[PDB]
Design brief:
It comes from Homo sapiens. It is built from eight helices and nine strands. With about 280 residues, it is α+β, with helices and mostly antiparallel strands. The ligand CONC(=O)c1cn(C2CCCCC2)c2nc(Nc3ccc(CCN4CCCC4)cc3)ncc2c1=O binds next to strand 2, strand 4 and strand 6.
Length: about 280
């Protein structure tokens, strides 16, 4: 679904600090980048932030009620508490008074990784995206935070084509995206998450392996030509794994295979992945 802080790094608190408040009159809205069922994000210019800056602003749609306004405040609260990292879309501000709740984050000018992969690209660039995402994920794991939608569509590229992850669950067009199965991104999910609804850092690691396959296939849909149905679930349960992508060095495919261990404890950690990638 969306990002979640779990217990045991140690979790002292379950996450609004008004230090983040920014005046909404100092934002000018531009184009819409995307929207979900209850949320949307627009690009904006913010004047005097922290500096005149292109930023992304997340807000509710008209269709949202108090339940959704709370999920948005709850996302703002998680973001305020995690702290900053180069490979996360960072919180910059919020407007929680004088109007609808606005959450202000870094704008990533190159858009999403999936579309970038699909549109020259070098092997070193692919390895960098892979490392950048792994670093963001190790950061989250170090904060006892689970992502639960790791996927190329959910990695953004900013200046220097540096990759960032973020919690885009409220602004993700889920209802009109057939990769979410009546709604879960099943082709990216670990078996324990499909068959037991269990979600852990290790389940995120499985999804990371799927992301790697997307990157090194240059954006193929996972499990090419295979429909999500009974046969699909039996395959993954029975240990079926996608073939090595055309642009993956064998050592990178070995990371995927490791991420896809059926036993979650036999999967690597994100720090181990970063370490191996740096080598
Ligand atoms: C924590 O809250 N932040 C988010 O939800 C953000 C959402 N999205 C997005 C995450 C992906 C899903 C949508 C919001 C962002 N997209 C960009 N960059 C971006 C630029 C261009 C495109 C393409 C725009 N066009 C596509 C067709 C018509 C418009 C997409 C993303 N920069 C930041 C964010 C968030 O902080």
């Amino acid at each position: 679904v969306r990002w979640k802080i779990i217990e045991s790094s140690y979790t002292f608190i379950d996450p609004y600090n008004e230090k983040w408040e920014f005046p909404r009159n100092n934002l000018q809205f531009g184009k819409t980048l995307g929207a979900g069922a209850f949320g949307k994000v627009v690009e904006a210019t913010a004047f005097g932030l922290g500096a005149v800056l292109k930023v992304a602003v997340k807000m509710l749609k008209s269709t949202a009620h108090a339940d959704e306004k709370e999920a948005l405040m709850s996302e703002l609260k998680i973001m305020s508490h995690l702290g900053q990292h180069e490979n996360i879309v960072n919180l910059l501000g919020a407007c929680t008074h004088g109007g609808p709740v606005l959450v202000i984050t870094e704008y990533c000018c190159y858009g999403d990784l999936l579309n970038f992969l699909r549109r020259q690209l070098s092997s070193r660039d692919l390895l960098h995206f892979s490392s950048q995402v792994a670093q963001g994920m190790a950061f989250l794991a170090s904060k006892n935070c689970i992502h639960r939608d790791v996927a190329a569509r959910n990695v953004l590229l900013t200046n220097g084509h540096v990759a960032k992850i973020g919690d885009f669950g409220l602004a993700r067009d889920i209802m009109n995206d057939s990769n979410y199965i009546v709604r879960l991104p099943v082709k990216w999910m670990a078996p324990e998450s499909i068959f037991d609804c269990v979600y852990t850092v290790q389940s995120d690691v499985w999804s990371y392996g799927i992301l790697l396959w997307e990157i090194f296939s240059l954006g193929l849909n996972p499990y090419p030509g295979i429909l999500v149905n009974s046969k699909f679930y039996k395959l993954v349960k029975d240990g079926y794994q996608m073939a090595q992508p055309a642009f993956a060095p064998k050592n990178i495919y070995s990371i995927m295979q490791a991420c896809w261990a059926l036993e979650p404890t036999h999967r690597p950690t994100f720090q181990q992945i970063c370490s191996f990638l740096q080598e």
